[PDB]
Each structure stands twice: as C-alpha cells, then as structure tokens.
Enzyme design. Structure first.
Site, PDB file in Angstrom:
ATOM      1  N   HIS A   1     -97.783   1.124 -27.141  1.00  0.00           N
ATOM      2  CA  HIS A   1     -96.577   1.939 -27.018  1.00  0.00           C
ATOM      3  C   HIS A   1     -96.200   2.080 -25.545  1.00  0.00           C
ATOM      4  O   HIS A   1     -96.655   2.991 -24.817  1.00  0.00           O
ATOM      5  CB  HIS A   1     -96.773   3.331 -27.645  1.00  0.00           C
ATOM      6  CG  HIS A   1     -95.476   4.031 -27.884  1.00  0.00           C
ATOM      7  ND1 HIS A   1     -94.300   3.676 -27.226  1.00  0.00           N
ATOM      8  CD2 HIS A   1     -95.207   5.050 -28.796  1.00  0.00           C
ATOM      9  CE1 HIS A   1     -93.365   4.478 -27.771  1.00  0.00           C
ATOM     10  NE2 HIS A   1     -93.858   5.325 -28.683  1.00  0.00           N
TER      11      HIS A   1
ATOM     12  N   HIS B   1     -90.208   4.860 -24.704  1.00  0.00           N
ATOM     13  CA  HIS B   1     -89.824   6.205 -25.134  1.00  0.00           C
ATOM     14  C   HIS B   1     -90.367   7.329 -24.266  1.00  0.00           C
ATOM     15  O   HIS B   1     -90.547   8.477 -24.732  1.00  0.00           O
ATOM     16  CB  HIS B   1     -90.158   6.458 -26.637  1.00  0.00           C
ATOM     17  CG  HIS B   1     -89.437   5.497 -27.533  1.00  0.00           C
ATOM     18  ND1 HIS B   1     -89.818   5.336 -28.841  1.00  0.00           N
ATOM     19  CD2 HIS B   1     -88.389   4.660 -27.314  1.00  0.00           C
ATOM     20  CE1 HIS B   1     -88.984   4.447 -29.380  1.00  0.00           C
ATOM     21  NE2 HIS B   1     -88.088   4.011 -28.511  1.00  0.00           N
TER      22      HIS B   1
ATOM     23  N   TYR C   1     -93.370   7.791 -22.936  1.00  0.00           N
ATOM     24  CA  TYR C   1     -94.786   8.102 -23.022  1.00  0.00           C
ATOM     25  C   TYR C   1     -95.544   7.504 -21.820  1.00  0.00           C
ATOM     26  O   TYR C   1     -94.886   7.098 -20.844  1.00  0.00           O
ATOM     27  CB  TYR C   1     -95.352   7.768 -24.423  1.00  0.00           C
ATOM     28  CG  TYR C   1     -94.628   8.598 -25.476  1.00  0.00           C
ATOM     29  CD1 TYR C   1     -94.775   9.985 -25.542  1.00  0.00           C
ATOM     30  CD2 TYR C   1     -93.761   7.994 -26.379  1.00  0.00           C
ATOM     31  CE1 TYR C   1     -94.108  10.747 -26.476  1.00  0.00           C
ATOM     32  CE2 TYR C   1     -93.071   8.742 -27.289  1.00  0.00           C
ATOM     33  CZ  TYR C   1     -93.243  10.111 -27.361  1.00  0.00           C
ATOM     34  OH  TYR C   1     -92.516  10.825 -28.287  1.00  0.00           O
TER      35      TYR C   1
END
Ligand SMILES: Cc1cc2nc3c(=O)[nH]c(=O)nc-3n(C[C@H](O)[C@H](O)[C@H](O)COP(=O)(O)O)c2cc1C
Ligand SMILES: O=[N+]([O-])c1cc([N+](=O)[O-])c(O)c([N+](=O)[O-])c1
Length: 363
Positions: A180, A183, A185
């Site tokens: 990930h 977004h 993070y």
C-alpha cells in the site's frame, strides 16, 4: 460483453476475467488482537468469482495500526485466521491478494503500542480523522494524533516489518501481496513533498523520497518472488490531504521506471480520491504503459464501459471495482449479463456486523 471477461496472466497466477475487487477497509475484525473473522471469510468467499480479490488493508505490525477493526498479518492468531479465509476463496476457485499497509501518521495514540504517538517521515499532523471504536464496539471518528518523525536508525526496521509480513502472507496462503504505497499512508507520506520535510537521504529529491518504497520492494521480492508482488500507487492528484507535489507527473514516471526494473507482477493505479480529481490524460496513460511491463490495474469510479474502452485501447489490463463489489458479490455475472446492481448502503461500509456486509444478495 467484450474484453472484460477474458483471462489475464497476473504474475504467478491466471485471472479468468479482468473484473477485480479493490481493497476495501470494512473495520469488522476482532479486538483485542486485530483478528480476521469467519464473517469476513464468508464475505470474501461470496466474492470469489472476481478475477482477483485484493483484501482490505492489513497491518504489517502493531505500530502500523491506524483504524480500530482493521486486521493484521503479524501474530500467530492472525496468520491462522487468514489461512481459513484464503482456503475459502480457493475452495471456490478464486484468487486473493493481501494489501499490506503501515498507516504512519493516519492514526491515534490510543491504538498505538504503549499509547504513544504514531510515526511518519516528519512530525506533521495529517489533519484528518481516523476510525476508533466506542465502549459498545461501534465505529466513531476521531482527529489524528501528531506523529513523531522516524529516526534514521528506525528505517531498516520498517523494511524488515514489510519483509516479515510478506513471509507471513505466503504461509497464510495468499496468491499475491499488494504493497500500500497510496492514499496518504506511510509509504506515500515519504513519497510526497507535502508530508516529507526530511534532510537525510530519505527526503528532498524524488530519488530520496522514493528510497523507502524501493527498499521495501527489493526486500519483498527477495523474500518471496517478484512475480508475487504488486503495488498500489496514487501518484497524480490529492488523496486524504496528501498531494504529489509540483512535479507530480515526472515524479510518477520516475517511480514507475524504478518499479519496472524489479519485474514485479502488477501496478495498481488509484486514479482519484473518493472526493474526485482530474482525469488521467491518454498521453499520460501511454507514458505509464511504455514504462511498466507487467499488468496495469486501473481504479477509481470506473464503469464497465470505461474499463472496456481503456482495455480495448491497450492502456490498462484490468479494473478494480470498490463500492460496486461491496454491494454485488456476483459483480462479474451481473456485468456479463447486463443485470441491474443492488443499491449501496454507505452507512454500513465501516464497522458493525453482517448487515451491509454479507446480506447483499447474488442473482
Ligand atoms: C469503504 C471503503 C474502504 C476503502 N478501503 C481501502 C483500503 O483498504 N485500501 C485502499 O487502497 N483503498 C481503499 N479504498 C479505495 C477503494 O479501493 C477504491 O479505490 C475506491 O472505492 C474508488 O473505486 P470505486 O469507485 O470503484 O468504489 C476504500 C474505499 C471505500 C469506499
Ligand atoms: O475508508 N477507509 O477506511 C480507507 C482505508 C484505506 N486504507 O488503506 O486503510 C484506504 O486506502 C482508503 N482509501 O484509499 O480511500 C480508505
């Protein structure tokens, strides 16, 4: 209909169609322990006709936790529970990837180890909210806690936590992993100049801002195999208050060229935040496509028609649907038949139980 229902080789596995289930945080894990549940197993098994399921974001470590109810993949009990989930998907002849995250500064001290401040590239508040649980187990929104900047000597431990979580994913029976890097993070907090004011080798230039994500990619390819690794990026636009800086296109193309050198399975582009953003130009899609030689997955408010257009133009290989997969377990069959979709119930996207989770009917 046209190409959406045709097979695609995705690293080590073969998807029978190009209709993927996007990663979707649902905040229904057991606490204490951040443990996946049988109800989560049923939800994923219902969706196993997807060309590929990408799981909800899953913690690599206890420090990685940002939201109450998000699962982990670091403890024995979590590994054992995920093994049941992947076995259910495989019993239905599906394929499932785990999305591995560290939330960085999108977190709250009350859910961190020892109740201490979360970590990031720099000591700047996210200026957003995360989701906690109240005394009755219900999801509630709370302002994020100001983070501490990671010390240079802590960065190898972050890399090692991703490495270990990929070893654990392989044991748990996942077919692939998705890093990930989107977004807002942790990995995106290092990539973006808005959230990274470091003056060491992990900030400043684009090469320094991408250093951490590329160290993570190298470590996980070494641990498992490159054909098991995917990555999600959101490199154009603004996502959860994290923009991509004043040179976003050039910086995106740099990162993509670097990822291509590792021969990883896929590149998953989250094109827009839920609140919207400017559409990708065809020229930029072409520049991405010529720099990456694995599968490209597009996501963000797609329709089947848009997916067919871009797949037919040779610009992407597959599409990930998020909210349509929340509401339609058999989305593949519905798109194939041109059937109506179930209506979405957003009030039950986060937290709770079976209602708004496993109670959307198939045809
Ligand atoms: C309830 C909800 C939870 C989400 N959780 C995640 C997440 O865990 N990981 C991630 O990368 N994106 C997450 N997203 C973004 C989705 O993967 C997807 O990119 C977005 O919903 C836009 O696609 P759609 O228009 O097909 O829903 C989430 C979106 C929603 C609506
Ligand atoms: O709502 N959510 O809980 C949510 C969570 C995650 N995540 O990885 O933890 C996302 O990436 C997004 N997202 O990207 O839009 C949303």
């Amino acid at each position: 209909a046209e190409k959406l229902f045709t097979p695609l080789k995705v690293g080590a596995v073969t998807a029978p169609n190009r209709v993927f289930m996007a990663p979707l945080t649902r905040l229904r894990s057991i606490e204490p322990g951040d443990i996946p549940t049988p109800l989560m197993g049923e939800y994923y098994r219902q969706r196993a006709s997807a060309g590929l399921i990408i799981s909800e974001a899953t913690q690599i470590s206890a420090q990685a936790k940002g939201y109450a109810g998000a699962p982990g993949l670091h403890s024995p009990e979590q590994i054992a529970a995920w093994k049941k989930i992947t076995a259910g998907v495989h019993a239905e002849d599906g394929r499932i990837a785990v999305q591995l995250w560290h939330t960085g500064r999108i977190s709250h001290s009350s859910i961190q180890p020892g109740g201490q401040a979360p970590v990031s590239a720099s000591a700047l508040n996210a200026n957003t909210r995360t989701s906690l649980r109240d005394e009755n187990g219900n999801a509630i929104r709370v302002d994020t806690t100001t983070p501490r900047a990671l010390e240079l000597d802590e960065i190898p431990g972050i890399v090692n936590d991703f490495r270990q979580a990929v070893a654990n994913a392989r044991e748990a029976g996942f077919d692939l992993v998705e890093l990930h890097s989107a977004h807002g993070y942790l990995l995106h907090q290092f990539l973006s100049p808005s959230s990274n004011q470091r003056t060491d080798q992990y900030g400043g230039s684009v090469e320094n801002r991408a250093r951490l994500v590329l160290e993570v990619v190298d470590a996980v390819c070494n641990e498992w195999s490159a054909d098991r690794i995917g990555i999600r990026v959101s490199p154009i636009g603004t996502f959860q208050n994290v923009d991509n800086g004043p040179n976003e296109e050039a910086d995106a193309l740099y990162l993509i060229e670097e990822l291509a050198k590792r021969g990883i399975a896929y590149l998953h582009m989250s094109e827009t935040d839920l609140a919207g953003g400017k559409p990708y130009s065809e020229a930029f899609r072409q520049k991405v496509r010529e720099r990456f030689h694995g599968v490209i997955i597009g996501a963000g408010a797609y329709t089947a028609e848009k997916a067919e257009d871009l797949i037919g133009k040779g610009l992407i290989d597959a599409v990930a649907f998020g909210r349509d997969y929340i509401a339609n377990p058999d989305l593949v069959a519905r798109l194939q038949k041109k059937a109506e979709l179930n209506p979405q119930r957003p009030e039950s996207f986060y937290g709770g139980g079976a209602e708004g989770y496993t109670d959307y009917p198939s045809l």
